[PDB]
Amino acid sequence: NYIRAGRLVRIIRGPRQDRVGVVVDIIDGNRVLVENPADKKMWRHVQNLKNVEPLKFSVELSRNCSTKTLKNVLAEKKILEKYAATKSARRIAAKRAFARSTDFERYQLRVAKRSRAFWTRKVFDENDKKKPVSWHKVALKKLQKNAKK
Amino acid sequence: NRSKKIQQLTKKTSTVKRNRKSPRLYMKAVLAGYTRGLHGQNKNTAIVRIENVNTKEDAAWYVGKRVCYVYHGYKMKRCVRWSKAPARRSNTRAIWGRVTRPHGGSGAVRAKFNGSAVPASAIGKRVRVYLYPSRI
Amino acid sequence: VKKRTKRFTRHKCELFPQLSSSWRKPRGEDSPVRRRYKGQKAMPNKGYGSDRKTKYITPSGFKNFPIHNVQDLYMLLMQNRKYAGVISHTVGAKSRKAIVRKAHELDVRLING
Amino acid sequence: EYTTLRKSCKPGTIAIILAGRFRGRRVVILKQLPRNGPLVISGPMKYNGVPIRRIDSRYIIATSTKVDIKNVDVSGITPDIFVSDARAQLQKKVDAALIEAIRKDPLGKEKAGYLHSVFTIKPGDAPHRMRW
Amino acid sequence: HRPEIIVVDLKDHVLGRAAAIVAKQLLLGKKITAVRCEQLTIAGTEIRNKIKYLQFLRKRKLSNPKLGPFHHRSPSDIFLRTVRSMLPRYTKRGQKALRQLVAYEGIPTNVVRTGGRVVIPKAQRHYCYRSERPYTVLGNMCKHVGWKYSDVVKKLETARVEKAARHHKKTEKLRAAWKSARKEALSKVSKNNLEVLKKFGY
RNA sequence: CCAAAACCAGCCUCUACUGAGCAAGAACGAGGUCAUGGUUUUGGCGGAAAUGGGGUGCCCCCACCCGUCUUGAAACACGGACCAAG
RNA sequence: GUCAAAACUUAUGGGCUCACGAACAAUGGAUGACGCUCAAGCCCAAUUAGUGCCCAUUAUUCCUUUGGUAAGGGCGAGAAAGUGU
RNA sequence: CGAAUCGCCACUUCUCUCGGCGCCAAGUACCUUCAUAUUCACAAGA
Ligand SMILES: [Mg+2]
Ligand SMILES: [Mg+2]
Ligand SMILES: [Mg+2]
């Protein structure tokens, strides 16, 4: 999706990793002035285009637009609050919670990733009745040979 | 005897493998080689490429961590609890070191193994860099 | 803890059976060893001198002192923690019986008792 | 008394054993010994099977998680102490106190289960990137 | 028993970057198994690279070509030579590492259905070539240089693909089960866990 | 004897001005370390153990045959099969 | 980039380039080799990024030696008026 | 014959342009064995 003023890029690899921010104004073809009132550290700055990943979001806006205009307009859409809603955003905050996590939270996760992986099988075993599975489907048909004997 | 194969199909309800035995609390490194220039190697300072360390600021995390080149001889020899722990008498042997400092901007670190060099056979081979002494 | 534990062998003693391993300083402009190219044998120098208070000290911790007869043992009576008598190779097994049961009575050490 | 034992390691904290017979075992740090001495972590053995026993601070990873076990009396842990009835009796008297101290906490059910946990450096796993 | 092999899938990788990264891992003890070396790319038109190879093939000992440089024409043998040129091929450390590499044209039935296939993102063609610049797929140039099995491999590659694809919808009912079974696992008794799964994105 | 941890010391690393910048100064905190010094502690090993030496092989690495006259020798320059006595 | 220690092929730097490109006619074959081409090339700048790293017989520091016709102090076993052991 | 190695799988193991699980109760309920193996020491276990 096209990069232009008002596009809502996601910074990738820099000091401001995950953070997003609207493309205030194009400079030339390899740079832009990113901005975003919602984060403390997304004061207007020159991101390289290599560094940003355009998002599907993009407020309508005019080049070299003043910042207070932006703390306005994005507020009237909540392009940001709308953005965090997406799995693409949650995945970024999700990995940003696991890396940020303490050891007991990782217990507190493994207990769930087993609590669920256990019930994934419990659901499946119940549903094992309906084929197929190597253990059940192979066997039901497998008996077909046994019945013939 | 396929009689037994039919019986086996009913009983299996569908499990999974689970790792429930002895944990490893060491990272798996590699003895990438001795520290060296174009002119040759310093056999008294090994380089150790720890898995998933990729970065220099991770490599810094590992400084001081004790490191092991475990291998084996062809006969048993005295080990740390040869008498207290007979169970432990392998012809398995181990050479210990310390991660000394990060090497390069990647995840590699420098390990001096005691006063001695680690043997050149160790190269390309599993060093095991332990999480201790702990800091964190 | 010694600087160098290896002998400083003569260059190319290994090829020529006649050459003793004992050191001779290399000469000849083109000697790889005196021109001290890095892959070559080393030459002895003042820098390999042993640490000077551990010098002459045998792993027993004693400085060896030659001994020939039972009277020599008293040369070591008062400094028996510093010197250890090494009985000369040519004293008889006869006399060594006498040096030895006396080097025992005096608490003086003997390297070859 | 004197203690340079680090701020991350405090009594009642959960703490991974990095070395020795009990690798990967989460273990509450019951107390530090009277001089700048090794910690006396305890399992409790009721959970992960770790006996009361000494461990050097260098050989554990003090997790941020803990328990307000000031209430527990670990006073019977003294250096002179360091399976006989006098000791089997000691932990039984302690683990039951230590184990209830774990119960008092909200989210005290996980910490019982959290201490049944065993740490393991699984492949692809990056402790140095970990926080604890 | 199988050793800890990792079967790199070399399709659409730059020849010499993949050969350089692989040549390093072999030294670090990885036991790699390159496949689809037919699919390695090279910068430039095939004519650029045929002429590079035919200048290679042009080199032989006059005294006795029999013992001269050997001009293997298999893309895989070409990748092994490329990867032995990048490791200490005369010391045993490197002579060893080179034998820890097993190149194949295509992906052979022993190596298929063995595990997931790795990739080298630093050696990806899209990562390396400027996209609109011409590029030489390797097994394509070497077909013109003497490799005789370029069509034997394509017939084989066609078969593993049509076969792997048949098994991909043989198992569609199965994968669909775990997808359904796992989604309804969240609805199960994992309550507090359902919030510890929401955080972290599960 | 091998280890490991600690302590102390050492050692090392990790405001000001200006119109957001510098040509700019320390502090707190923490880490590392004995191939640094002094303080033990704690374990492991104990006919054998242990350190050292020696021998043989390997590994990685380094390494052009010496003497010679010569500006220049690995030289496609000379002398050089072995050893003993001289 | 590998060989080769180091950018596990760093840059959240700029340009340029398609075919060569990287200080001092005849045995087949040489950017050192491979290979590289949004370079692993060239010019430029950089150092984690509009918020570096590697390698010396070098330097510094530590230990030891040796020399000083160098500077001082001193006179459980030792304490010698001493160039040199 | 003592060994070094230390994730598995027919949910990856097709193609062409967050794979699942495992990590100490077969499960989220901690029922429940672990000590003296006496604070590192090849995991004494696979
Ligand atoms: Mg001339
Ligand atoms: Mg390298
Ligand atoms: Mg073992």
E102: its two tokens: 């097993």
Q: Give the nucleotide with minimal C1' distance to the Cα of B81.
A: F44
Give the nearest chain B residue to E30 (CA atoms).
B124
- The contacts of residue D19 (CB under 8 Å, 6+ apart) are B25, B130, B132, D59
> Position B20: which residue type?
R
- Residue pair E38/E156 in contact by the 8 Å Cβ criterion: no
Give the nearest chain B residue to D132 (CA atoms).
B136
Q: How far is the CA of C36 from the C1' of G5 (A)?
A: 25
- Residue pair A121/A115 in contact by the 8 Å Cβ criterion: no
Protein-proximal nucleotides of chain H (any atom < 7 Å from a CB): 2-30, 32-46
| 3-class state of residue A129 by DSSP | helix
Give the Cα separation of A118 and B100 in Å (integer): 44
- The contacts of residue A101 (CB under 8 Å, 6+ apart) are A109, D131, E200
Give the Cα separation of D97 and D44 in Å (integer): 10
For residue B32, give how far its alpha carbon lies from the nearest alpha carbon of chain E (Å): 6
- Cβ-Cβ contacts under 8 Å, D110 against chain A: 104, 107-108, 111
Count of helices and strands (H, E) across chain E: 9, 4
- The contacts of residue E125 (CB under 8 Å, 6+ apart) are E12, E13, E14, E41, E135
- Which residues 94 to 113 of D reach strand H, CB within 7 A? 109, 112-113
Structure obtained using: cryo-EM
* Cis-peptide into B86, omega within 30 deg: no
- Cβ-Cβ contacts under 8 Å, E193 against chain A: 111-112, 115-116
C18: its two tokens: 């006649």
* Residue E60 CB burial class (10 angstroms; 0-12, 13-18, ≥19): middle
> Position A74: which residue type?
L
Kindly compute the dihedral angle of the four CA atoms of residues D58, D60, D63, D65, in this order, to the nearest 10 degrees: -120
Give the Cα separation of E149 and E10 in Å (integer): 18
As a three-state string, the secondary structure of A9-36 is EEECCCCCCCCEEEEEEECCCCEEEEEC
> Position E194: which residue type?
L
- Which residues 3 to 22 of D reach strand H, CB within 7 A? 19-21
Give the Cα separation of C110 and B50 in Å (integer): 54
Subunit contact D131:A102, Cβ cutoff 8 A: yes
Q: Within A13-136, where are the H helices?
A: 67-73, 79-83, 87-98, 103-126
D10: its two tokens: 């405090």
| 3-class state of residue D130 by DSSP | coil
B51: its two tokens: 């898995």
Q: Provide the resolution (angstroms).
A: 2.5
B97, containing H or E segment: strand B92-102
E6, containing H or E segment: strand E5-6
Do strands C83-87 and C63-67 pair parallel, antiparallel, or not at all (unpaired)? parallel
Cα atoms in the Cβ-side hemisphere of radius 13 Å centred on A15: 5
- Among residues C26, C23, C50, C49, which one has the least CA distance to residue C37? C26
- Residue pair C103/C113 in contact by the 8 Å Cβ criterion: yes
CB of E130 within 8 Å of a chain A CB? The answer is no
> Position B56: which residue type?
K
| 3-class state of residue E24 by DSSP | helix
- Residue pair D18/B130 in contact by the 8 Å Cβ criterion: yes
Per-position b or e across B90-119, b if 16+ CB within 10 A of its CB: eeeeebebbbbebbeeebbbbbbbeeebbe
Subunit contact B131:D23, Cβ cutoff 8 A: no
- Among residues E86, E106, E198, which one has the least CA distance to residue E152? E106
Could you tell me the CA-to-CA distances from C100 to C96, C104, C108, C113 in Å, in that order? 6, 6, 10, 6
Give the Cα separation of D20 and E82 in Å (integer): 47
Q: Give the nucleotide with minimal C1' distance to the Cα of D58.
A: F5
- Among residues E108, E103, E111, which one has the least CA distance to residue E78? E103
What is the sign of the dihedral through the CA atoms of A69, A75, A78 and A80?
Answer: positive
| 3-class state of residue A96 by DSSP | helix
User: How would you classify residue E46: left for phi > 0, otherwise alpha for psi between -120 and 50, otherwise beta?
Assistant: alpha
A78-84's contacts with Cβ under 8 Å and 24+ in sequence apart are A79/A8, A79/A22, A80/A8, A80/A20, A80/A36, A80/A38, A82/A57, A83/A8, A83/A20, A83/A55, A83/A57
Between the CA of C32 and the centroid of ligand 1 the distance, in Å, is 22
- In the numeric block, the tokens 């001795």 are attached to B34
How does DSSP assign C70-104, residue by residue? GGGGGGSSTTTTTEEEEE-TTS-HHHHHHHHHHHH
Could you tell me the CA-to-CA distances from A124 to B31, B111, E83 in Å, in that order? 45, 49, 47
> Position D19: which residue type?
A
Give the nearest chain D residue to B28 (CA atoms).
D123
Subunit contact A109:E188, Cβ cutoff 8 A: no
Q: How many CB atoms lie within 10 A of CB E68?
A: 12
Give the Cα separation of C74 and C63 in Å (integer): 16
E18: its two tokens: 């993949």
